[model samples]
Target: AESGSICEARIDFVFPEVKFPSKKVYLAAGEELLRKLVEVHHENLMKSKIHYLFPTSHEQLRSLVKRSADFVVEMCGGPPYYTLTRGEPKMRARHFSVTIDEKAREIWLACYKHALKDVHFPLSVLEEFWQWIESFSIRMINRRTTLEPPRRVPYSEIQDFFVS
Candidate 1:
């Protein structure tokens, strides 16, 4: 159950009760984002050393896409499919072995930003969506720290690191 502080802090805070028009909207946007991600962002990551952390086959990628989409939808007040299927709140453990660092997270965020642009979701929903993803992504960083309950780089700073 060992994980990052951001995640622990997140549990203490109340989840926003924000609801989207429909789960379908979340699903559609997620699918589109994942599609562009696999085509462009994922390919770029594969060219780098971080590629080793990612899946190798098409089926695994598809499963990743679905799971990611489900998580997003759940975050937006849709069905709790992600939790039901993947279990409730163990993101850090799920990714504990990945060795994510600041540069890796920056690249990950940049790719997601690019995917968001490519998907062309409604401008209205973009801000809220970005808020969730930004915070959640930052929470998933599992870099080793030495300080007592070491702190992570704040989302405010990380959000600006990836400009595309």
Candidate 2:
């Protein structure tokens, strides 16, 4: 059987976990943290472009929620598994050509701040969420001084992977 996490507000609803394989990561977010962040901190995180890889709209935001959910699910061997789409979870290889310097990192941070403001989640949970995301972005960066991969694929071939 498949298990999942669900979140909803008075008039707003977000089933971020629907796209995941299960609820492990959602559980990691913790009930207290999820409640507060969904209810509060969401707004602050939306404030800047730092957090967004592309310009997003309401529908797009929902799609991102789906993507985030998918990430967690696959992390736990859930549905839409990365292993099925790509051979493995090669984070550095997947993000290889994209620019991810200090500026890029800060942009992500800025968006997160705005999203937090927009959501207005509980204080305790809000801080935790920010700290965790910040740490994650920092770690995503490969420890510097390493040279770029010698072989680079053409953009068209890379883009084809998503097109089916």
Candidate 3:
């Protein structure tokens, strides 16, 4: 991406909105549904990993995020222009309220690893994707040196606040 190659990324999304019979769905049911969705995606992506770019550094990762955002706007039939309107992405300004410690990042990486497991892609492809996704933690560290006390959050409660 640094070469200004004018490459674009393709995104495949899974919509898993279920009409629950009740308001409270147990964690087991939710996880099962998510796993099933990942499996389905794995099947689809097994057809090709060319749609995915292999990013390695912070700049490369940022490029993917930009591409993904552009893809979202394009899906709505909008023009491909993020900076022309929104200016630079203020990542720290947007995420300063959240605490992204090392453990939380590891948990996220684990989930993505599990999700990718169902795909029959080569190890190189998986490692490339994982390496790219892992850099998000370093890039998203907003409250790292804050003087304020860390919030009283449980282990599983950290995901919602990620890059908020």
Candidate 4:
């Protein structure tokens, strides 16, 4: 079963148990915040190892950011703008265009962490949103470079990062 690596295992999609932050995120942060959070996240990603993964042109970047925001905002329970324009949210297929390894996934999550703090997301619901993104990201790791399992970043670690 070489094709099936045990290191990363099978990352499943399970909505947060205590609270799904979809509504909480937009509700607490206000309407525009999700897009703002995603904008910074993509900006941070452009500076990371996956910089090449982003669009190069300034105008293109803005376009990508806008569409990306649409997706995130909808994911956070705001609206169906993404579906309206892009059709069903086939996240994996969209990401499958590129090879996203565990390392890349970590970088992506790190960028989002920075974005989360930069946008000043509501603190009380922060854990809920963090939990959702952190776990959900494992599904994005399509390529595997290590025999070790993908790093599990509980909100505790992220909280510490923010505290510092």
lDDT of 4 at 137: 75
* C-alpha positional error of residue 94 in candidate 2 after TM-score superposition, expressed in Å: 3.3
Name the weakest run of 10 consecutive residues (lDDT summed) in model 1: 11-20
For each candidate, what is the lDDT?
Answer: 0.59, 0.45, 0.41, 0.80
Clash numbers, per candidate:
0, 34, 0, 0
User: What is the per-residue lDDT of model 1 for residues 1-164, given as tens digits with 9 covering 90 to 100?
Assistant: 56654543443222233333444445655654534544665556666657888888999977876776666667655678689998776776777878886567667766666666655655555655655555556556677343333233343544433444
The parts of candidate 3 lying over 4 Å away from their true place are 1-87, 119-124, 144-164
Which residue pairs overlap in candidate 3's backbone?
none
lDDT of residue 135 for candidate 2 = 50
**134 Cα displacement, candidate 2 (Å):** 0.9
Winner on TM-score between 2 and 3 is: 2
Task: Choose 3 or 4, whichever is better by lDDT.
Answer: 4
What are the runs in model 2 whose C-alpha is more than 4 Å off?
1-65, 72-90, 142-164
Which residue runs does candidate 4 get wrong by more than 4 Å? 1-20
lDDT of 4 by residue, 87-164 (tens): 887677788888898889889998999988888887877888888878777766778787777888888876976666
Best by lDDT: 4
TM-score of each: 0.61, 0.42, 0.33, 0.83
What is the lDDT for 64 in model 2? 47
Judged by whole-model lDDT over C-alpha atoms, candidate 4 comes out at 0.80
Candidate 3 per-residue C-alpha lDDT over 1-164 given as tens digits, one digit per residue, 9 for 90 to 100: 68768867753322222221221221212333333434443334333332232334668655645554443233223443555655665654655665654444445445545444543333423333334345433455443444443233232343333323
Highest-TM-score candidate: 4
